[PDB]
C-alpha cells in the first residue's frame, strides 16, 4: 500500500498527459496482467455485509462483524477468517452448525451475482480476500489481501486494477477494452488525459486507505 | 441496495 502510493506519486509527478508526444501503447506490459480482480459485488452492508465474486468465479463476503467467508470456485471448498485473523479451511458440506447463517447468506449472494450481474473483465484471458472497501459518490474502492487495489467508477463504468507487486495498472475503459501498463513506462512514454485523471484519483484513494487502516 | 453493473 505504501509502495503503491509511491508508484502513483512518481507517475503523477511526471505529468504523463501534458509533456509532449504521448506514446501510451509503448507503456503496455501484457506480462503484468493481474491474476485476480473483482468481477462482481453486492453492497448489502446495511444488514449483512459486502459480497463479491473474483475473476476466477470464487466468491467472498466481508460480513459486518469483520469476519470473512470465502468460497472457492469448486463450489464447496471454504475458507473462514475470524476477527482476530484466525483462518479456517473446510467445506460447505462439512461446516459447523455455527456458520449456518453465514453460509446461507453467501450462497444467496452467490446466486444473485452469478445470475443478475455482469462479469467485469469477461474478455480478459484467464486466493486473495477483501481486506477492506469503501464507497464514494464516484467510485467503489476495493483493497485485496494480496496488495491489489481496485477502483470501479460508477458513472462511466471505467475501472482500474492496481498491482503493487508488478508496479502496474490495468485500465478498463467505457468500451470494456483492457490494457495493462507498467507505471514507470507510463512515466517514460506518457498517457491520455482520461487515464491520467483516474490515476490522480487513484493516488487520493490509496491515501484514504492508508489513513483509515 | 447497491451492486455492480447488471
Numbering used by the authors:
A (entry chain A): 374 to 499, 508 to 594
B (entry chain B): 1 to 6
What does the paper say about this structure?
As a prototypical example, we focus here on the polo-box domain (PBD) of polo-like kinase 1 (Plk1), a serine/threonine kinase that is overexpressed in a wide range of cancers, and is a known anticancer target due to its critical role in mitotic progression. Recently, a secondary hydrophobic binding site proximal to the primary phosphopeptide binding site has been identified by two independent approaches. Crystal structures have revealed that this pocket can accommodate hydrophobic side-chains of several ligands in slightly different binding modes, with a resulting increase in affinity;12–16 however, when ligands are not bound to it, the pocket is closed. The walls of the hydrophobic PBD secondary binding site comprise Tyr417, Tyr421, Leu478, Tyr481 and Tyr485, with Val415 and Phe482 lying at the bottom.
Here, we show that although opening of the pocket is highly unfavorable in the absence of a ligand, it is possible to identify all of its known ligand-binding modes, as well as a novel mode, by using a modified ligand-mapping technique. The previously unknown binding mode was used as a basis for the design of a new ligand with similar affinity to others binding this pocket. The predictions were validated by solving the crystal structure of the bound complex. These conformations are involved in a new “half open” binding mode in which a benzene molecule lodges in a smaller cleft formed by five of the hydrophobic pocket residues: Val415, Tyr417, Tyr481, Phe482 and Tyr485. Based on the known structure of FDPPLHSpTA bound to PBD, the new ligand was modeled by replacing the N-terminal FDP residues with a 3-phenylpropanoyl moiety, which incorporates a minimal aliphatic linker between the phenyl group in the pocket and the truncated peptide. Evidence for the stability of this chimeric peptide ligand at the pocket was provided by an MD simulation of its complex with PBD. We synthesized the ligand and determined its KD to be 330 nm by isothermal titration calorimetry (ITC), comparable to that of the significantly larger FDPPLHSpTA peptide (250 nm).
